[PDB]
Design an enzyme around this catalytic site. Sequence first.
Site, mmCIF file in Angstrom:
data_model
loop_
_atom_site.group_PDB
_atom_site.id
_atom_site.type_symbol
_atom_site.label_atom_id
_atom_site.label_comp_id
_atom_site.label_asym_id
_atom_site.label_seq_id
_atom_site.Cartn_x
_atom_site.Cartn_y
_atom_site.Cartn_z
ATOM 1 N N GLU A 11 31.336 -20.403 16.541
ATOM 2 C CA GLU A 11 31.460 -20.610 15.128
ATOM 3 C C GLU A 11 31.165 -22.022 14.739
ATOM 4 O OE1 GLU A 11 34.007 -17.494 13.288
ATOM 5 O OE2 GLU A 11 31.820 -17.479 12.609
ATOM 6 N N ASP A 20 32.759 -23.983 2.521
ATOM 7 C CA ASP A 20 32.126 -22.902 3.254
ATOM 8 C C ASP A 20 31.018 -22.238 2.384
ATOM 9 O OD1 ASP A 20 33.411 -21.302 1.319
ATOM 10 O OD2 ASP A 20 35.054 -20.823 2.668
ATOM 11 N N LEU A 32 40.690 -23.089 6.442
ATOM 12 C CA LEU A 32 40.704 -23.194 4.981
ATOM 13 C C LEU A 32 41.793 -24.110 4.534
ATOM 14 C CD1 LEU A 32 39.718 -22.089 2.143
ATOM 15 C CD2 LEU A 32 41.874 -20.868 2.205
ATOM 16 N N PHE A 104 38.234 -12.921 14.157
ATOM 17 C CA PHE A 104 37.837 -14.055 13.365
ATOM 18 C C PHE A 104 36.565 -13.771 12.658
ATOM 19 C CE2 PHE A 104 39.471 -18.579 14.165
ATOM 20 C CZ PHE A 104 40.721 -18.178 14.637
ATOM 21 N N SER A 117 35.913 1.982 21.638
ATOM 22 C CA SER A 117 35.752 0.807 22.441
ATOM 23 C C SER A 117 37.080 0.308 22.848
ATOM 24 C CB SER A 117 34.974 -0.271 21.729
ATOM 25 O OG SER A 117 33.635 0.171 21.671
#
Length: 164
Positions: A11, A20, A32, A104, A117
Amino acid sequence: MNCFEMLRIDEGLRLKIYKDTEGYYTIGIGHLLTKSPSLNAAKSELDKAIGRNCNGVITKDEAEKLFNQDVDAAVRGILRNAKLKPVYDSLDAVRRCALINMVFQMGETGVAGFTNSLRMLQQKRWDEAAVNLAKSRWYNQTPNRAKRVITTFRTGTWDAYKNL
Protein backbone atom coordinates in the site's frame (compact mmCIF):
# COMPACT_ATOMS: atom_id res chain seq x y z
CA MET A 1 9.38 -9.04 8.62
CA ASN A 2 6.00 -8.31 9.99
CA CYS A 3 2.68 -7.03 8.93
CA PHE A 4 3.97 -3.46 8.67
CA GLU A 5 6.49 -4.32 6.08
CA MET A 6 4.05 -6.23 3.89
CA LEU A 7 1.64 -3.32 3.87
CA ARG A 8 4.40 -0.75 3.55
CA ILE A 9 5.15 -2.54 0.29
CA ASP A 10 1.60 -3.20 -0.98
CA GLU A 11 0.00 0.00 0.00
CA GLY A 12 2.77 2.47 0.75
CA LEU A 13 4.01 4.47 3.74
CA ARG A 14 3.81 8.29 3.76
CA LEU A 15 5.54 10.27 6.55
CA LYS A 16 3.92 13.67 5.78
CA ILE A 17 0.17 14.37 5.79
CA TYR A 18 -1.30 13.67 2.29
CA LYS A 19 -4.85 13.74 0.81
CA ASP A 20 -6.24 10.38 -0.24
CA THR A 21 -8.12 9.72 -3.52
CA GLU A 22 -11.20 11.41 -2.04
CA GLY A 23 -9.41 14.43 -0.55
CA TYR A 24 -9.05 13.34 3.06
CA TYR A 25 -5.97 14.10 5.14
CA THR A 26 -4.08 10.92 5.81
CA ILE A 27 -0.74 9.72 6.92
CA GLY A 28 1.32 6.62 7.51
CA ILE A 29 -0.12 3.57 5.90
CA GLY A 30 -3.56 4.96 4.98
CA HIS A 31 -4.19 6.30 8.51
CA LEU A 32 -7.09 8.70 8.31
CA LEU A 33 -6.64 11.80 10.35
CA THR A 34 -9.96 13.62 9.89
CA LYS A 35 -12.75 14.15 7.47
CA SER A 36 -12.47 17.88 8.02
CA PRO A 37 -11.20 19.99 5.06
CA SER A 38 -8.76 21.74 7.24
CA LEU A 39 -5.02 21.10 7.01
CA ASN A 40 -4.73 22.65 10.55
CA ALA A 41 -7.42 20.44 11.94
CA ALA A 42 -5.50 17.59 10.34
CA LYS A 43 -2.23 18.65 11.97
CA SER A 44 -4.16 19.08 15.26
CA GLU A 45 -5.38 15.50 15.15
CA LEU A 46 -1.90 14.23 14.45
CA ASP A 47 -0.37 15.99 17.44
CA LYS A 48 -3.18 14.43 19.54
CA ALA A 49 -2.56 11.01 18.28
CA ILE A 50 1.20 11.32 18.57
CA GLY A 51 1.14 13.30 21.67
CA ARG A 52 3.53 15.78 20.37
CA ASN A 53 4.11 18.76 18.15
CA CYS A 54 4.65 17.32 14.71
CA ASN A 55 3.61 19.86 12.21
CA GLY A 56 2.38 17.09 9.95
CA VAL A 57 5.45 14.97 9.80
CA ILE A 58 6.11 11.73 11.64
CA THR A 59 8.83 9.16 12.04
CA LYS A 60 8.68 5.59 10.80
CA ASP A 61 8.33 4.36 14.23
CA GLU A 62 5.34 6.58 14.82
CA ALA A 63 3.65 5.49 11.73
CA GLU A 64 4.18 1.97 12.94
CA LYS A 65 2.43 2.84 16.14
CA LEU A 66 -0.57 4.11 14.14
CA PHE A 67 -0.53 1.17 11.80
CA ASN A 68 -0.76 -1.17 14.80
CA GLN A 69 -3.82 0.67 16.19
CA ASP A 70 -5.40 0.35 12.78
CA VAL A 71 -4.52 -3.33 12.80
CA ASP A 72 -6.07 -3.79 16.21
CA ALA A 73 -9.35 -2.19 15.10
CA ALA A 74 -9.42 -4.47 12.03
CA VAL A 75 -8.95 -7.57 14.18
CA ARG A 76 -11.51 -6.53 16.60
CA GLY A 77 -13.98 -6.47 13.77
CA ILE A 78 -12.84 -9.77 12.42
CA LEU A 79 -13.40 -11.37 15.70
CA ARG A 80 -17.06 -10.22 15.78
CA ASN A 81 -17.50 -11.86 12.33
CA ALA A 82 -18.73 -15.47 12.30
CA LYS A 83 -17.31 -16.30 9.01
CA LEU A 84 -14.00 -14.73 9.59
CA LYS A 85 -13.43 -15.46 13.16
CA PRO A 86 -12.59 -19.19 12.95
CA VAL A 87 -10.24 -18.72 9.98
CA TYR A 88 -8.19 -15.96 11.59
CA ASP A 89 -8.27 -18.03 14.69
CA SER A 90 -6.82 -20.85 12.75
CA LEU A 91 -3.96 -19.11 10.82
CA ASP A 92 -0.40 -18.51 11.71
CA ALA A 93 1.02 -15.03 12.11
CA VAL A 94 2.27 -14.66 8.66
CA ARG A 95 -0.99 -15.94 7.20
CA ARG A 96 -2.90 -13.66 9.52
CA CYS A 97 -1.04 -10.77 7.95
CA ALA A 98 -2.22 -11.81 4.48
CA LEU A 99 -5.85 -11.89 5.62
CA ILE A 100 -5.49 -8.45 7.14
CA ASN A 101 -3.99 -7.29 4.01
CA MET A 102 -7.15 -8.31 2.22
CA VAL A 103 -9.37 -6.63 4.74
CA PHE A 104 -7.47 -3.41 4.40
CA GLN A 105 -7.86 -3.65 0.68
CA MET A 106 -11.52 -4.53 0.20
CA GLY A 107 -13.03 -4.35 3.67
CA GLU A 108 -14.48 -6.84 6.06
CA THR A 109 -17.49 -7.38 3.98
CA GLY A 110 -15.62 -8.10 0.76
CA VAL A 111 -13.46 -10.80 2.36
CA ALA A 112 -16.40 -12.44 4.02
CA GLY A 113 -17.58 -13.07 0.48
CA PHE A 114 -14.82 -15.71 -0.22
CA THR A 115 -16.92 -18.41 1.36
CA ASN A 116 -15.15 -21.26 -0.10
CA SER A 117 -11.69 -19.85 -0.01
CA LEU A 118 -12.10 -19.17 3.55
CA ARG A 119 -13.24 -22.70 4.16
CA MET A 120 -10.16 -24.11 2.55
CA LEU A 121 -7.89 -21.85 4.51
CA GLN A 122 -9.32 -22.96 7.80
CA GLN A 123 -8.63 -26.51 6.74
CA LYS A 124 -5.01 -25.87 5.61
CA ARG A 125 -5.63 -26.72 1.98
CA TRP A 126 -3.16 -24.12 0.94
CA ASP A 127 -2.97 -24.97 -2.70
CA GLU A 128 -6.66 -25.35 -3.27
CA ALA A 129 -7.08 -22.06 -1.51
CA ALA A 130 -4.56 -20.43 -3.76
CA VAL A 131 -6.33 -21.91 -6.80
CA ASN A 132 -9.55 -20.72 -5.49
CA LEU A 133 -8.39 -17.31 -4.75
CA ALA A 134 -7.09 -16.80 -8.26
CA LYS A 135 -10.62 -16.97 -9.76
CA SER A 136 -11.82 -13.88 -7.95
CA ARG A 137 -12.52 -10.63 -9.43
CA TRP A 138 -9.89 -9.17 -7.07
CA TYR A 139 -7.15 -11.30 -8.59
CA ASN A 140 -7.87 -9.86 -11.94
CA GLN A 141 -8.05 -6.21 -10.84
CA THR A 142 -4.89 -5.91 -8.68
CA PRO A 143 -2.96 -8.88 -9.84
CA ASN A 144 0.49 -7.95 -8.48
CA ARG A 145 -0.80 -7.39 -5.01
CA ALA A 146 -3.15 -10.33 -5.25
CA LYS A 147 -0.40 -12.70 -6.43
CA ARG A 148 1.82 -11.67 -3.45
CA VAL A 149 -1.02 -12.14 -0.98
CA ILE A 150 -1.97 -15.57 -2.33
CA THR A 151 1.61 -16.66 -2.38
CA THR A 152 1.80 -15.75 1.33
CA PHE A 153 -1.30 -17.82 2.05
CA ARG A 154 0.12 -20.62 -0.01
CA THR A 155 3.60 -20.77 1.54
CA GLY A 156 3.22 -19.24 5.01
CA THR A 157 6.40 -17.16 4.38
CA TRP A 158 7.36 -13.72 3.08
CA ASP A 159 9.00 -15.05 0.00
CA ALA A 160 6.76 -13.09 -2.25
CA TYR A 161 8.13 -9.99 -0.65
CA LYS A 162 11.76 -11.02 -0.34
CA ASN A 163 13.39 -8.72 -2.84
CA LEU A 164 10.97 -5.82 -2.71
